[PDB]
């Protein structure tokens, strides 16, 4: 199926206490595989997935240098954004960058991405044509005009149609036993009385990969999407995720309610009841 490769980077100024903190991670789909923290002794990119430890010393060397260089450029950009917005050097600010690529079943590129955010809001984003920029404000338009002078979109497009797709397919082949298996969710229904006339039905979906999951409660075939507490999907400490959906029903009418679970790892959509 379709697969993703993304790099996230975060730089945070630390006025008074020292250099900005820079932390970057790489994800293949929902599997983290590289990390880097500038606060280490001698900061170095490290493998967080088994299929990436295969790479040789030149790989980790070039990655380590790229991450240190990105930290330097992030300090540069933080100072520049300080002077763009006429802000105070005593305030802490955040810069967040993501970039990457989505490939299809045929391994062909569908979309490339490159986005930058300042203080948690969109700053500038490479359009889908890989040829234009969306700027969020006039400061981002300054940056846009400086980046159009430097053909940053052309460098990015050479990278995305080239090295991104190639190395994503490489990573996929390397660890296909894990990355290409869809772990179906273990599903069950729990019952917890809250009063003499009411009780919670909780629908679980433990043990699944990827994270994309659909949990729905239905009362006699009518969706209860407003009367259903639905929690965010969370990691289980491994590459596996968890998620549940609860509805509070009167004690006596449990069999009016049905849970419905949809996952990539399931052959058919599932329907569950409390037994």
């Amino acid at each position: 199926g379709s697969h993703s490769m993304r790099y996230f980077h975060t730089s945070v100024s630390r006025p008074g206490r020292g250099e900005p903190r820079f932390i970057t991670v790489g994800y293949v789909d929902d599997t983290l595989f590289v990390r880097f923290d500038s606060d280490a002794a001698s900061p170095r990119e490290e493998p967080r997935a088994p299929w990436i430890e295969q790479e040789g010393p030149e790989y980790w060397d070039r990655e380590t240098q790229i991450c240190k260089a990105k930290a330097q450029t992030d300090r540069e950009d933080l100072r520049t954004l300080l002077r763009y917005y006429n802000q105070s050097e005593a305030g802490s600010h955040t810069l967040q960058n993501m970039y990457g690529c989505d490939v299809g079943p045929d391994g062909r590129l569908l979309r490339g991405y490159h986005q930058d955010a300042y203080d948690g809001k969109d700053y500038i984003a490479l359009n889908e044509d890989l040829s234009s920029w969306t700027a969020a404000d006039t400061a981002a338009q300054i940056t846009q005009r400086k980046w159009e002078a430097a053909r940053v979109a052309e460098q990015l497009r050479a990278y995305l149609e080239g090295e991104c797709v190639e190395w994503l397919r490489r990573y996929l082949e390397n660890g296909k036993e894990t990355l290409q298996r869809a772990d179906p969710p273990k599903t069950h229904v729990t019952h917890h009385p809250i009063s003499d006339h009411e009780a919670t039905l909780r629908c679980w979906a433990l043990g699944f990969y990827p994270a994309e999951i659909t949990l729905t409660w239905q009362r006699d075939g009518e969706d209860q999407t407003q009367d259903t507490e639905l929690v965010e999907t969370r990691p289980a400490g491994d590459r596996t995720f968890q998620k549940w959906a609860a509805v509070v029903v009167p004690s006596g009418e449990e069999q009016r309610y049905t849970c419905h679970v949809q996952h990539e790892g399931l052959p058919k959509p599932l329907t569950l009841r409390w037994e």
């Binding site: 790099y7 790489g26 790989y59 070039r62 990655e63 790229i66 991450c67 260089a69 990105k70 450029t73 970039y99 430097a150 940053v152 460098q155 990015l156 990278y159 090295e163 991104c164 190395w167």
Partner: peptide, 7 residues
């Protein structure tokens, strides 16, 4: 592998 802007 990672990308790096020109400069």
């Amino acid at each position: 592998k990672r990308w790096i802007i020109l400069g």
